[PDB]
């Protein structure tokens, strides 16, 4: 039950010359047949291939000071940003990795950064050693990401990154980690490496590698950053990762005693090729493509070609000629990153099912025996013949100038076992949310512009995939935005709206907060005929509604009563929609730090908090609302825009609620009200459709009777902190007896007071759990008084009791920082390749 388990490549990232800043841009360069040879930049201080942004670093993203960033070797910084991008390609939000066996293996050597004396002004003392010692290149990644498997920096020159891959594959097979980042980085800071190869006469004047060409006259120095994410195939499939290829086998060895430390030996190259085949249990006939070391040196190219001839050339059998190429023909010699660059080239190929081409410049080298016809240069895009197995495979080679050699077999990934897919809460409406996050607003804007450009340049991409990917395969940062969209084109328009600062429907913006969420249960006038009907397909919701039907009939003979009103029906139905909407938020991941209610709302809130069972909570609102129909006739209520005290004629009307700084309820005698009302026809007052006045003495008649009816209820300790609008503070759920429920009907509702307290205590998000926003505007006004940044949210709305509205609410709750379990909401779609985090890099170059 143990063997060389296949290792899977689940992500990849690279920064390479020729303006390549992602695997996909590398594909463009290779199919274009453009190269990157250009003159050395002046901004370094002393022809070749150079990275666009070698010295740019989003230092603030990773919490690194600008002084330390200036001291960090540009290789340390590329490795750190490219590691991040690789995990994003694997679809792993890097936070989930903190405390993980994840290992880091970085191939690298020294390139002459920070060799002068430190200009004291720059103030890099205390940072320069750590910014430039090899082990830190790998240790820093594990520090910044909280990774806890092995972290090593390895130097074998040109093969460094393939040796790092080889080591990570053993680490994974051995149990030393369960996920690994492996790759290499180089940035030619100083001119020492270029100078030594010039002196040797090893560099083409072009700056271009002409691999296997008659025009080969030396290699072109390059640089870059190339990283893959490795995982044992079993763990990959079990976690449903998107496998890009697999390392079927790999090998490492040494030239030994060649003719000069740098001299190449074809025999060594053959043996390393053959150990790889052995580890992978294949023969050369099973490999259609070879991505060679391929540096364009007159004497080395034939050495490499003779060993391919002696290995891949023989017994090709059924398999036609082997295709041969080298990515150095487009980007130059990327030194410590050369190997994995090659590996990312063949992986791009596997995606598209074709053999990646090479910039063939001129005629084949006359020094190579092509007479067998068994090796062909990959001149343009070609068919990738599977092997007799039906498996496509490639071979990648890196032969370092210190004599250590590597060869790796990359194979297409096996077919995944199909698994039963999880269900998506909320019926499908074609509308999908697409969420964005960055560490600043400029970065947030840039993310949105890039997603829009990608989706415009890549249409046909399934919006469900962009939705799932940006919610499940990306980390959520401080500054957020979300865009509802029914089809790709509507996404681009609204993503551009985020990008350019436009307010537009279907687009929301917000900052994520530490503080808790408070569920506001209003009651009052949240009802509308036909409410929340479109949510009865949702089992979480429908089930709550059904159990509510059971216990209502037993206590009031009533039920759904919305297949197609009056106070002792409306209140038992608004109770039911509110505890149901609450359970729906719960099952979508919004967990309440506290519950608060307005009058009857407090009964749904006590249920939602666990202080009263669903049964007792129904009985309390059924026999509280039957008891109010018994003091009908005389009595009514009115809303009065304008704050209390100013509204505070006596003995017939009194203040019965306070809802915000600019909103009060007054109640008392029916006629007496019309009096106040038509008085104000000359304040924006308005009367509530009521035949009685609660929170007044008109209710003392039903006291004792109510208290009795609800004497069998059993208040329990709450699971969620219940804030009493009566007491004005937190209250053990045992204290919610009939007395409390009478005193709730009689005493005045100090709701503005409670919202002020909860704002004082630092709660961040108020979610009105109701079929129509009733208190939301009043709460929003209270927060403006306290000059607060707390956010207020509705759930459903009249003409909006649909899933599309709850989806909108989920989108806004998440944008404010409420934890939406997007897995439970958008089930589990596939991972699509979308732009990475939009690093806001500044230049640092000592």
């Amino acid at each position, epitope marked *: 039950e143990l063997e060389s388990e296949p290792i899977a490549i689940v992500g990849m990232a690279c920064r390479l010359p020729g303006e390549v800043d992602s695997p996909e841009r590398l594909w463009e360069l290779i199919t274009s047949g453009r190269d990157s040879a250009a003159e050395v930049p002046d901004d370094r201080g002393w022809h070749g291939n150079f990275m666009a942004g070698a010295g740019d670093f989003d230092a603030a993203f990773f919490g690194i000071s600008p002084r330390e960033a200036l001291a960090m070797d540009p290789q340390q910084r590329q490795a750190l940003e490219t590691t991040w991008e690789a995990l994003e390609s694997a679809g792993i939000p890097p936070e989930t990795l903190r405390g993980s066996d994840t290992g880091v293996f970085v191939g690298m050597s020294h390139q002459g950064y920070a060799t002068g004396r430190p200009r004291p002004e720059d103030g890099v003392d205390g940072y320069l050693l750590t910014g430039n010692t090899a082990s830190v290149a790998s240790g820093r990644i594990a520090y910044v990401l909280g990774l806890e498997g092995p972290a090593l920096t390895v130097d074998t020159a040109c093969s460094s990154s393939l040796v790092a891959l080889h080591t990570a594959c053993g680490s994974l097979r051995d149990g030393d980690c369960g996920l690994a980042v492996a790759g290499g980085v180089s940035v030619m800071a100083g001119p020492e490496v270029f100078t030594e190869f010039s002196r040797q006469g090893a560099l083409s004047p072009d700056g271009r590698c002409k691999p296997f060409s008659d025009e080969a006259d030396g290699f072109g120095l390059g640089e870059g950053s190339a990283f893959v994410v490795l995982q044992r195939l079993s763990d990959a499939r079990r976690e449903g990762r998107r496998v890009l290829g697999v390392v079927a086998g790999s090998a490492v060895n040494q030239d030994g005693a060649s003719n000069g430390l740098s001299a190449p030996s074809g025999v060594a190259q053959q043996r390393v090729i053959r150990r790889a085949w052995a580890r992978a249990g294949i023969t050369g006939a099973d490999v259609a493509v070879v991505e060679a070391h391929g540096t364009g040196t007159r004497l080395g190219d034939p050495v490499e070609a003779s060993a391919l001839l002696a290995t891949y050339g023989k017994s090709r059998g059924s398999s036609g000629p082997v295709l041969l190429g080298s990515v150095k023909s487009n980007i130059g010699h990327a030194q410590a990153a050369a190997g994995v660059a090659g590996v990312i080239k063949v992986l791009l190929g596997l995606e598209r099912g074709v053999v990646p081409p090479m910039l063939c410049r001129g005629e084949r080298s006359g020094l190579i025996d092509w007479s067998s016809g068994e090796i062909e240069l990959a001149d343009g895009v070609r068919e990738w013949s599977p092997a007799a197995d039906g498996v496509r495979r490639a071979g990648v080679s890196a032969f370092g100038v210190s004599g250590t050699n590597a060869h790796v077999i990359i194979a297409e990934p096996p077919e995944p076992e199909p*698994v*039963p*897919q*999880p*269900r998506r809460m909320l*019926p499908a409406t074609g509308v999908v949310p697409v969420v964005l996050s960055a560490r600043t607003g400029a970065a947030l804007r840039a993310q949105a512009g890039r997603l829009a450009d990608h989706l415009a340049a890549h249409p046909g991409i399934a919006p469900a995939d962009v939705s799932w990917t940006m919610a499940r395969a990306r980390q959520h940062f401080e500054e957020r935005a979300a865009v509802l969209a029914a089809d790709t084109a509507e996404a681009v328009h609204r993503l551009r709206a985020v990008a350019d600062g436009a307010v537009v429907p279907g687009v929301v913006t917000g900052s994520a907060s530490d503080g808790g969420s408070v569920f506001v249960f209003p009651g009052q006038g949240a009802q509308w005929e036909g409410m929340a*009907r479109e949510l*009865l*397909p*949702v*089992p*979480v*919701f*429908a*089930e709550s*509604i*059904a*159990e509510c039907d*059971a*216990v209502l*009939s037993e206590v009031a003979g009533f*039920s*759904v009563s*919305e*297949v*197609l009103e009056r106070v002792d029906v409306v209140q038992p139905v608004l109770f039911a929609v509110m505890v149901s909407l609450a359970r729906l938020w719960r*099952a979508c991941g919004a967990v309440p730090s506290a519950v608060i209610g307005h009058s009857q709302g407090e009964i749904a809130a006590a249920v939602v908090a666990g202080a009263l069972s669903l*049964e007792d909570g129904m009985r309390v609102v059924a026999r509280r609302s039957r008891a109010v129909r018994a003091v009908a006739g005389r009595g009514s209520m009115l809303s009065v825009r304008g704050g209390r005290s100013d509204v505070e004629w006596t003995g017939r009307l009194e203040v019965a609620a306070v809802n915000g700084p600019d909103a009060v309820v007054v109640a008392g005698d029916a006629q007496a009200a019309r009096e106040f009302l038509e008085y104000c026809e000359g304040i924006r007052a308005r009367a509530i459709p009521v035949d009685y006045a609660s929170h007044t003495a008109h209710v003392e008649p039903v006291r004792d009777e109510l208290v009795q009816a609800l004497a069998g209820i059993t208040p329990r300790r709450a699971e969620v902190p219940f804030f009493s609008t009566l007491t004005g503070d937190f209250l053990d759920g045992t204290e919610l007896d009939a007395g409390y429920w009478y005193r709730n009907l009689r005493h005045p509702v100090e709701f503005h007071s409670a919202v002020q307290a909860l704002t004082d205590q630092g709660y961040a998000t108020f979610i009105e759990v109701s079929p129509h926003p009733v208190l939301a505007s009043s709460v929003q006004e209270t927060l403006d008084d306290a000059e607060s940044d707390a956010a207020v949210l509705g759930t459903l709305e009249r003409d909006a009791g649909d899933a599309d509205r709850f989806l909108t609410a989920l989108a806004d709750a998440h944008t404010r920082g409420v934890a939406v379990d997007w897995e*439970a909401v958008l089930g589990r779609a596939g991972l699509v390749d979308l732009p990475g985090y939009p690093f806001q890099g500044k230049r640092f170059w000592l």
Partner: antibody, heavy 118, light 109 residues
Framework: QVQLQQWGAGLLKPSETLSLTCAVY????????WSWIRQPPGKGLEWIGE???????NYNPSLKSRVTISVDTSKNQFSLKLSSVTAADTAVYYC????????????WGQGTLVTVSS | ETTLTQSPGTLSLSPGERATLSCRAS???????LAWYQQKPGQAPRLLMY???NRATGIPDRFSGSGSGTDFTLTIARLEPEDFAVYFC?????????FGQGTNVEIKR
């Protein structure tokens, strides 16, 4: 209250077509997901399909090719048709109320034994 | 399809004892989409638990449901006579809604 009654031909010959119907009494046919669930003898139950008062259906892929369920909203009734029957289909067929698409079932029919023999 | 394997085959006990009925899924399922049923013989199933742990209206409080991803459990505090029956779990989170093969709960003598 709520109560379910189903009727239909119990005995069938192979290659024929099972046809049962269920009647809902007192319930709100609107908003619930009326469902067929069979149970081969002494075995675990197996979900066939469902339909709401609108006509939206959902069938188990294991039988979709030969199953059809339907509603009559003015009769308050819903029904199962199962083609090309076989002795595999010998089961106790039950109609039931689903609290949401493909959900839990609270109210259940009395069960119709359906025996496919020759 | 997701598979539900119930355990044990047939738990025997006597009235009063505590019966613990278990159910293992072939893959993880949200707790919101698991259910428990009782089936007295020659009758229909009767819903006991929905959403893993929520007791259906009218079900005595001695029936307790619990469990998470893959492993869920139904527990009766005190076996009363009318409880001796067969019990079925049901997952309804994977597209194909599926049911346990069943566990008998017989009289021990």
């Amino acid at each position: 209250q709520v109560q379910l009654q189903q009727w239909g031909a119990g005995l069938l010959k192979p290659s024929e077509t099972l046809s049962l119907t269920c009647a809902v009494y007192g319930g709100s046919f609107s908003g619930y997901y009326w469902s067929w669930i069979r149970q081969p003898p002494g075995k675990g139950l197996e979900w066939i399909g469902e339909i709401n008062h609108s006509g939206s259906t959902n069938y188990n892929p294991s039988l979709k090719s030969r199953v059809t369920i339907s509603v009559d909203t003015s009769k308050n009734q819903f029904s199962l048709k199962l083609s090309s029957v076989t002795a595999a289909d010998t089961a106790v067929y039950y109609c039931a109320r689903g609290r949401g698409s493909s959900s839990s079932f609270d109210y259940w029919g009395q069960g119709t034994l359906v025996t496919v023999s020759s | 399809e997701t598979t539900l394997t119930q355990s044990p085959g047939t738990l025997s006990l006597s009235p009063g004892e505590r019966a613990t009925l278990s159910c293992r899924a072939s893959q993880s399922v949200s707790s919101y989409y698991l259910a428990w049923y009782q089936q007295k013989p020659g009758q229909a199933p009767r819903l006991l638990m929905y959403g893993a742990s929520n007791r259906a209206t009218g079900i005595p409080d001695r029936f307790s449901g619990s469990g998470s991803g893959t492993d869920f459990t139904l527990t009766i505090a005190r076996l009363e006579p009318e409880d001796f029956a067969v019990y079925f779990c049901q997952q309804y989170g994977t597209s194909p809604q599926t049911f346990g093969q069943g566990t008998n709960v017989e009289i021990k003598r």
